[PDB]
């Protein structure tokens, strides 16, 4: 169990950590959040009381340092930041779960809520996408547009998803257009998970960090990004039984954790009918078809 | 964007544009089998491909061999006319390819876009106006060719005979919409009325009937008559 403290709290946010989230009021004292799961990643996020626009985070994983939150009165936002010097450390840590001024992340036993939104998101490759070398942790927020946005406009502050476009030479090869444009079993076998991603848990990692990046900033590049390597796996007659099993699991832990009154800007209406309904893969998705229809047989 | 009634006069200026309607190119009867069951026959048909403002049509013949032992034929017959619009294309010299290419009918917008990826320069618009390319089928030798032809052929012919001579292509496009919205209303009497007088033939190389000045108007008249006659009769106004 790891911690990340905070050394204070100077102005009213909303602070979430994963998908659970705090009231703190201005100056209140508030020292960071105890108790969180190590093994996997983690997002800790901020919407000021005063600016319900921009939420904002951090994607970090405690294996890889010590993490904490300072506020920056001068840029205005909680920053993370790494302490290199081990031993301060641990006795910031242990003085603020002394005075008990922590919160501990407040998981459920029985739940594997976040395992499941996570399970194949990695830290590494969050970087790749988010790319700042200089830290570990990686920022992200509602504004930042991704390299497919800026191509149809500052690259350090885009997020670099892989680039998927069915109606481009690298999705269609010359003579097979209407197979190929029809069937896309040739851009998601080949052209994406043995050239790009090598393998599906890359290729779902990137799919459930979009995801995320969505619904907790609603990023709306990474939404963009999750319907479309959703679409290209359903819209591919071929695709190996492990993927399309672990894809109905991936899909409706998303689809239960959504907010219900989100669901009209996060959920692309001809994407999830097409999907469910018309393609390749409409019989493969069972437990997600059963979840969408029943907690939002509107946009259907 | 879409070609409406708005930005009509784009299509006689001096950047190269292509018609394509796709209407004719999947032609079948239908019939009862023995057992009393249904069955098409796939007839011959066509791609009509139109420079607008030159007359040019580039009519690329659609064997009933190019259906055989394929299914969903509808779909294929969107995705081969764009195979063959894009092979056309590729075939002209640089300064000949077209600047745009408006599909007459919006299933097309995917497969054409699809076979001009090495174009990208080259716009696939769709349009607004109900152009009435389907009468092609209409114009006696059009139809004569597409129904001999024994196996794929490119036929070119001017869709505007020598009226260039004489008058401008929006003139042009004009006249030949309006004769093949006539046919496309009421064949019998479009053609009753092109045709009346032995004494107006058609010359070997044109489609329609050499009309002096004077002739074109009552022609046109004419068709604008019937047109007319035709709506009231639909819509009992």
Known sequence: ?300 | GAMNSSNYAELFNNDIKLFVDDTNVYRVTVHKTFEGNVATKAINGCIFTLNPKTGHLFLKIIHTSVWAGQKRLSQLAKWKTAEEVSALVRSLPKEEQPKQIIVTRKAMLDPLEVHMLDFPNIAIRPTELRLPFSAAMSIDKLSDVVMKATEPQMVLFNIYDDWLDRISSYTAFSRLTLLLRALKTNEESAKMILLSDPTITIKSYHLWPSFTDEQWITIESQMRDLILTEYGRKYNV
């Open chain 1, 1 to 300: 169990m790891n911690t990340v403290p905070f050394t204070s709290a100077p102005i009213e946010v909303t602070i979430g950590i994963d998908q659970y989230s705090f009231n703190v009021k201005e100056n209140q004292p508030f020292h960071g959040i105890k108790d969180i799961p190590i093994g996997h990643v983690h997002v800790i996020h901020f919407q000021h009381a005063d600016n319900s626009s921009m939420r904002y985070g951090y994607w970090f994983d405690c294996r890889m340092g010590n993490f904490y939150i300072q506020y920056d009165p001068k840029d205005g936002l909680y920053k993370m930041m790494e302490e290199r010097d081990g031993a301060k450390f641990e006795n910031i840590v242990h003085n603020f779960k002394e005075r008990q001024m922590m919160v501990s992340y407040p998981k459920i036993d029985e739940d594997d809520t976040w395992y499941n939104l996570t399970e194949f998101v990695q830290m590494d490759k969050i970087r790749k996408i988010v790319r700042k070398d200089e830290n570990q942790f990686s920022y992200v927020d509602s504004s930042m547009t991704t390299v497919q946005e800026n191509e149809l406009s500052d690259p350090a502050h885009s997020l670099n998803y892989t680039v998927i476009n069915f109606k481009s030479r690298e999705a269609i090869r010359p003579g097979h257009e209407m197979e190929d444009f029809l069937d896309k079993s040739y851009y998601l076998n080949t052209v994406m998970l043995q050239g790009i991603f090598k393998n599906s848990s890359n290729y779902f990692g990137e799919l459930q960090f979009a995801f995320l990046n969505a619904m907790f900033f609603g990023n709306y590049g990474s939404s963009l990004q999750w319907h479309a390597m959703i679409e290209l796996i359903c819209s591919s007659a071929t695709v190996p039984k492990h993927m399309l099993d672990k894809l109905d699991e991936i899909l409706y832990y998303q689809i239960k954790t959504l907010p219900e009154q989100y669901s009209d800007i996060l959920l692309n209406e001809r994407v999830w009918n097409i999907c469910l309904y018309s393609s390749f893969q409409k019989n493969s998705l069972h437990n997600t078809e059963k979840i969408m229809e029943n907690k939002y047989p509107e946009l259907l």
